[PDB]
Amino acid sequence: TNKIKIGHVHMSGCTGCLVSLADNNLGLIKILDDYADLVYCLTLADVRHIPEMDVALVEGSVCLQDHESVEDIKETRKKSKIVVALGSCACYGNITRFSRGGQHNQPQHESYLPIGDLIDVDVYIPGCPPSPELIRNVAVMAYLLLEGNEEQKELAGKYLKPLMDLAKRGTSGCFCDLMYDVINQGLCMGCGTCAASCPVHAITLEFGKPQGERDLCIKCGSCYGACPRSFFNLDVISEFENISEIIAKALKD
Amino acid sequence: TNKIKIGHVHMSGCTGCLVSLADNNLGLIKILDDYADLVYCLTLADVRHIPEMDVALVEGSVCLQDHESVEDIKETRKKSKIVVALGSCACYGNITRFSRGGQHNQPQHESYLPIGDLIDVDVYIPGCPPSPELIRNVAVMAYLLLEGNEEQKELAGKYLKPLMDLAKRGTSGCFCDLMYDVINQGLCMGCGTCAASCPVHAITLEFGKPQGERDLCIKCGSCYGACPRSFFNLDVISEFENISEIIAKALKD
Amino acid sequence: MIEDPYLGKYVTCVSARSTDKEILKKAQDGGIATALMVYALEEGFIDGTIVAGEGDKPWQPKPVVAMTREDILKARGTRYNISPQISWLKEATRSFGLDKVGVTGVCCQMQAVRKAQLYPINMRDVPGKVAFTVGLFCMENFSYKSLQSIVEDHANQSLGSVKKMEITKGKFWVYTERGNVATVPLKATHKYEQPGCHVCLDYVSNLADISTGSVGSPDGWSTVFIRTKVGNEIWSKAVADGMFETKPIEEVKPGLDLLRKLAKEKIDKNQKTVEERKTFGINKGLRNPYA
Amino acid sequence: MIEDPYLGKYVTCVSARSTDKEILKKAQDGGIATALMVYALEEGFIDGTIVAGEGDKPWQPKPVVAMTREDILKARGTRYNISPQISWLKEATRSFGLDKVGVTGVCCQMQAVRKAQLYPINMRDVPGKVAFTVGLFCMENFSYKSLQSIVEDHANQSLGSVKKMEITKGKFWVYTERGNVATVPLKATHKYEQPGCHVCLDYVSNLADISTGSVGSPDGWSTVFIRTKVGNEIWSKAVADGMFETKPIEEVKPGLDLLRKLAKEKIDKNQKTVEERKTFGINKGLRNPYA
Amino acid sequence: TKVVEISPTTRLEGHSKLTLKVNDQGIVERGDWLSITPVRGIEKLAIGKTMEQVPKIASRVCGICPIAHTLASTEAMEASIGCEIPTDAKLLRIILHAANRIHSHALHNILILPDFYIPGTEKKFNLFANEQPARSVMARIVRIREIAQTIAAIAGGEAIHPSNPRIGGMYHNVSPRAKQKMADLAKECLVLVHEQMEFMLDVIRNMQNREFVEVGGKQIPLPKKLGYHNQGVMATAPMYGSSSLDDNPTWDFTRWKETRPWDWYMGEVTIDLEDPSYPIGGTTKVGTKANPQMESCTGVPTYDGQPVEVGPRARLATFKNFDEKGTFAQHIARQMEYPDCCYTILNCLDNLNTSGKVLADHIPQGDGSMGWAANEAPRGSNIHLARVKDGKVRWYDMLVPTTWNFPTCSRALTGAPWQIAEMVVRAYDPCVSCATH
Amino acid sequence: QMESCTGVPTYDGQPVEVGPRARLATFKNFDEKGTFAQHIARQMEYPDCCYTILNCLDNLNTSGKVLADHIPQGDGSMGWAANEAPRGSNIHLARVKDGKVRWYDMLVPTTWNFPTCSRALTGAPWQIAEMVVRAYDPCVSCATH
Ligand SMILES: Cc1cc2nc3c(=O)[nH]c(=O)nc-3n(C[C@H](O)[C@H](O)[C@H](O)COP(=O)(O)OP(=O)(O)OC[C@H]3O[C@@H](n4cnc5c(N)ncnc54)[C@H](O)[C@@H]3O)c2cc1C
Ligand SMILES: Cc1cc2nc3c(=O)[nH]c(=O)nc-3n(C[C@H](O)[C@H](O)[C@H](O)COP(=O)(O)OP(=O)(O)OC[C@H]3O[C@@H](n4cnc5c(N)ncnc54)[C@H](O)[C@@H]3O)c2cc1C
Ligand code: NFU
Ligand code: NFU
Ligand code: SF4
Ligand code: SF4
Ligand code: SF4
Ligand code: SF4
Ligand code: SF4
Ligand code: SF4
Ligand code: SF4
Ligand code: SF4
Ligand SMILES: [Fe+3]
Ligand SMILES: [Fe+3]
Ligand SMILES: [Xe]
Ligand SMILES: [Xe]
Ligand SMILES: [Xe]
Ligand SMILES: [Xe]
Ligand SMILES: [Xe]
Ligand SMILES: [Xe]
Ligand SMILES: [Xe]
Ligand SMILES: [Xe]
Ligand SMILES: [Xe]
Ligand SMILES: [Xe]
Ligand SMILES: [Xe]
Ligand SMILES: [Xe]
Ligand SMILES: [Xe]
Ligand SMILES: [Xe]
């Protein structure tokens, strides 16, 4: 079979999403060797314009007052079969929610939206920083979804489903997700997972229940993501040993 | 014509929404005299059970683990032509977003949702506290929508439209509304109105742009409401002198 | 009651200037906004008014509840950056204890006031205590860093030396206290406009009780629209009391024809901008507060 | 590889208890959870493990990363209120510098670990450094104020006097250090359960490497399920090394038949609860994390 | 004079472009390298936020060097409020800081080698390719970065956007095992970075001995004084940094003034030279208009009224009187910083007391006084300035290393074949998201 | 015992009545008890409210300072405050450390009155049990909080 064609599109991001991918180490080189061609990535290669892509890893959000930027993200949807919001800036805005303009030398650069507000997004990879393991897993599963037998494209399509459901749920991420859609919903069980995943130590548990420092939270959506009562697809997660073995196989030398 | 039949349904609220209504003073007595019967209100009258209502002013939110409470709010939809979420607890959760259980003598009373999450809501009256003027205006316009000539039911139906659009937009209120749907959208013009309406002084303007103390904000939705770049229905608001004259007429002695 | 589709609904329109010479010494134009609030205070139509007072950096405006003639005059002159006038609208009726609040500002600020009067959202007591609005014409506004960049880089002037600023006749004008003048072509300034001004469809402050501006009248003179019953009672009384020199707008150059043309360009340009938000994306668009 | 639909997927199931007498002195049951982590530490399968250690109020558990035999034993005994075990899952791989993390907890906590391994959302380094999970059976949990109300009002005991607590045979059992015993009917306690336990469809910790509990075995003895390859390598080695007394579950009363029945009641009861959330409202329902 | 424009740049972080005026031979006469990254405005959004939040937001300026913004921002708050952090918190911050310099320099090796030749040949390095020696070189780099990111996560809580720093010190000290593990990793890393350092120095020495390089088919001559400028250098420490809490700060805020691109960049021009063959997609179409004064997205900080170079050569010139300048000098200086990083880590681990305190007993809330902190980030002096009052940021300013290097690199472009203008740029290890913030 | 949504605060081990009669008995030795006594005591509090307001306005300096120059962040010590709310003693207790609330407790007037009113119900026709209740001016949202 053919390797899929993968591009890295960089909007208003910090390149930490790209770095996370590279922090797969030899796993990334195994992927690039056997399953994917990087057709585009301004940081690593000299391809000046957005080619056609099977999978586009888009990082960062969109500044509505930068013409070239609105064009790049429209062009990316046009040129790509699967669009991935890579990281919390692309999924949910993250720190660019806080942008409000007035700084040199473009005081009018004021308004920033996550990509799903301008184009349709197929898969979310939430996190700030996003976990290398997730980016790898999503890349391998995208390859099975496109060049595997029917048994794999079925596995791969079930794995990716909650990440696709997140892209259809909305473009907002915040500590309050855990209130709205978990505690307020009767679903919280006090496991503490949200506290472990928060990257700015904004979450403590008081008497088994989440307490959010909302003026510390940078609005990344990680905690609802990781919460085992947001999505819990029993068909995938109960096969953890098997799916882990498959993934390790796909990277073995 | 007949007076419309109005009820006050009290969920998990503080009765401050009711107090606001009463703070219309003689205007409320004018309304009760000439245009509406209060068929239900546990605070003011002895009617023990929820009768049928033309308009139901529902205050407070719904505790999912109190059986009687889930029943009352379903019963209210069944018994009412127009359902009004009166105040921010009913519209958006407000301080009950923060509830998480563990207090005597019902440690399991844990989860609270705004009413629109359990039943369909026709009109929002946001605020904490909600402004008496708005509750009055909405009550007079509801009467015109039901017992007036076609010229009034047209006026009244256009006035109420943004309050109906808010009920369909969602059940979440927060300072971040001004980021998501105004600043992030290119719409903020720095008028400062949000700062005036915030009831806990959570909002300052820094260089003409909103700055939110998110650990002060009690999640009431007032600031997006009052913002002149959330909804601005030019057909009503440009007729301010006329609509003001009509409203004053309806209460004159 | 005319009903221009670019000048809003109004009773009459004349070209005026205050007869109070001390007020005219630093007024931007004819001194209409200052003279109307001073007179409203002395007569008792208002007991206080929000104005753009002096702030903490040079040429940065700071809203304030003025309650004396002297505090009102402190707000003379146009400041070309944002002054969040409405932030004190509710507080005026609380700690300040006012019964009859005045408000001054540009067109969007008048709209906020009218919205608060009809849809008060946590704005208790405001609808019935707004007593007088005076609205300025406004083509667009800037942030402070924008005004800094225009004045200091493009005009090459020190802000601590500037006595007056004026947009007119296609140029940004800076006047120094020692007597020099500098200009900037308006094409250079277009990157510096506040993005939220690009969806504004109101030029002569349609929703004010009285409206006032510069275009249409000679230097030192204001183009004034009287619009509401409140605007009419106060303006009549003030002319009767000698507060104003008038001249019908028809017998003044450039007059109401130039004004209608600049209003028309603003709405059509911005209306286009409003239309494109709808299809800004691919299968997705941006919000429209007007839908 | 059996595949019970109420007991999950597992290789074998025996009734066991640790041969380490010092560990058995305060173990809740057979001392399986303690003995498996101690042995995993001494053998090198883990270099540390999250356990429910002693906290700051009596009978309040506090999660902690244990890295010595002595710290592990401090977590013996069942605490009937929430211990957010996973809050330290990532920190174990950072400041603590662990390569091979153990985790202990109830069924929902095992699910969090497995979810983090497959969908790490800001959980970098966790998937490949989780090395051993031991899961307890769990019918339901309580908040601290619930456990306070049960013990002090219903059992009428002082928390500072309680040496052990046990839910079994339809009653909540309290044992004091001076020797008394008190019970509460489980019907009385139903208002005090954590509401989020009512949608839980997992009784014997299906997703653990090894699972262990009380039901099915005599007092002082544990019902144990070996499930994953990791669970198998470690359990085999430990029996070989003499760490355990075993007995096939079939030749033990009440044995695997009682267990399957209580598991079945939990899932069916909770599954009904999950189903009703769908129509909880009028034309509206509540979220289902399982959809 | 003609006008050629490369947009976007590649093999650097972020979004910039080169707008070059060239003579009749295609040599730069005056080039402008400018940012076209949209301005997120961190310094303005900071105002009114808590002093705890602002460093965690500023970290998200850049994911290659988040350590630099977390530390410079946190220590600007500590300096404004007068907070002295415990010794064991300082030691963990230095370990975090040196680990991150190792990973950043190694990443930059990946970005610059495609322009370099396998010594003595005419084959350029291709690292992607499963051929030697490229592949065993990529393996060394991958393990260096991995060691570096692991040490960073241990001492810093997270390798990208460290969680452990806080006003007053750190959230956590590390366990005895963590300390052993960082020591073990830094022993392995010291061997590797010595190998990599020697490897890169030989490749650069071979480049200094070439007369031309090949760019999209053509031979491009390699000038002797490639990338020379007369701006001088500015550096605050050979390793860590300096703050206004110090008895003798090594940065003088009285010598700094930030202006707008206005004073140093070119005005409007029109592109009258184009090359569709430039790898890979050609240059800007003829007839396009460009205005670096108005398209540049950064401000121009100056020292004694002039732009300056910052970064690894800035540091070695300031502290050891390193006396070579230009493109290849910059590459050399950067590689020479490899071993110090690992010696520092090991010295710091040796003095660290894992039982010691990491949080100052008292954190004052601030009275509005100005403080500043300089972090010597992988690319140069990173200076944050702050006024904190009642725990809130009332004034904030960031002078980031690539911001300093933009006007200085631009001037360094004179005398270069426009086809290797990008090579002059890459010697600065540019981070355009940083520079713009 | 199980449907009641409040806790039962006690003083010297017993429930107590709070509110306007509680105040007049404590401070003036007001010596009538029960439903109509409670109504009387409450009305007698009308004039003090307006005399207080006027005395306070008279001493108020509108140019004076309203914010303490220094706000300490707290070391975890317990403090409490009692407000004589319209229905009785409202006592909040707190431990604040580093500007955060580490422990909080609220003893609200209608919470105090619940068990005390219950006992007051003895000897009444069940049809006027509600009249006995209304003399306490109950606020059940307060009592439950
Ligand atoms: C951004 C801005 C843009 C404008 N654009 C135009 C235009 O395009 N065409 C035209 O004819 N006129 C425009 N004007 C109005 C004009 O410049 C004069 O200010 C107006 O005629 C009032 O002059 P005056 O002599 O009556 O007022 P004065 O007696 O000089 O009193 C000044 C009034 O201006 C208010 N004010 C000053 N600065 C601000 C500010 N940033 N925000 C809110 N209120 C402020 C003050 O409250 C005060 O009442 C603009 C004003 C502003 C602030
Ligand atoms: C709410 C709860 C409900 C339970 N319900 C049942 C049941 O219905 N039927 C049944 O057979 N068994 C149940 N168990 C398990 C049983 O009570 C024993 O705890 C189990 O068999 C372990 O005993 P042991 O002798 O091997 O462990 P020990 O050697 O005594 O070690 C104790 C283990 O329990 C962990 N632990 C203790 N309290 C908690 C807590 N709140 N949260 C997370 N981890 C904790 C500790 O980390 C430790 O590893 C429950 C346990 C808990 C916490
Ligand atoms: N080194 C570095 Fe950053 Ni990505 C830059 N420039 C900043 O501090
Ligand atoms: N008075 C009164 Fe409240 Ni509505 C009561 N009880 C509280 O403090
Ligand atoms: S999600 Fe975080 S790591 Fe990714 S671009 Fe945004 S700031 Fe950087
Ligand atoms: S991760 Fe989810 S279920 Fe677990 S404590 Fe946090 S909100 Fe509650
Ligand atoms: S609380 Fe922490 S994990 Fe959740 S959205 Fe805020 S920053 Fe992200
Ligand atoms: S919205 Fe505010 S006033 Fe209305 S019930 Fe809720 S807390 Fe009370
Ligand atoms: S009210 Fe709306 S438009 Fe006015 S300053 Fe606030 S968010 Fe901006
Ligand atoms: S900021 Fe203030 S007005 Fe807006 S949602 Fe929060 S509490 Fe309400
Ligand atoms: S152009 Fe319109 S929105 Fe912008 S300041 Fe002027 S009145 Fe306000
Ligand atoms: S019943 Fe289920 S959700 Fe509740 S504690 Fe036990 S394992 Fe967790
Ligand atoms: Fe800066
Ligand atoms: Fe209480
Ligand atoms: Xe990278
Ligand atoms: Xe890479
Ligand atoms: Xe890839
Ligand atoms: Xe890539
Ligand atoms: Xe997909
Ligand atoms: Xe990848
Ligand atoms: Xe994918
Ligand atoms: Xe009321
Ligand atoms: Xe009332
Ligand atoms: Xe009413
Ligand atoms: Xe009412
Ligand atoms: Xe309606
Ligand atoms: Xe009303
Ligand atoms: Xe209505």
Residue numbers in the entry:
A (entry chain G), B (entry chain G): 18 to 270
C (entry chain B), D (entry chain B): 1 to 291
E (entry chain A): 2 to 438
F (entry chain A): 294 to 438
The authors write:
To further explore the initial interaction of MbFRH with H2, we also investigated possible intramolecular H2 transfer pathways. To this end, MbFRH crystals were derivatized with xenon to explore hydrophobic gas channels connecting the exterior of the enzyme with the [NiFe] active site. These experiments revealed a second H2‐transfer channel that has not been observed in similar studies on other [NiFe] hydrogenases. Surprisingly, the unrelated [NiFeSe] hydrogenase from Desulfovibrio vulgaris Hildenborough features a similar hydrophobic tunnel, indicating analogous developments in certain hydrogenases that operate bidirectionally in vivo. While this narrow channel appears obstructed in crystal structures of other [NiFe] hydrogenases,21a, 21b dynamically enhanced H2 transfer via this route remains as a far‐reaching possibility and a target for future studies.
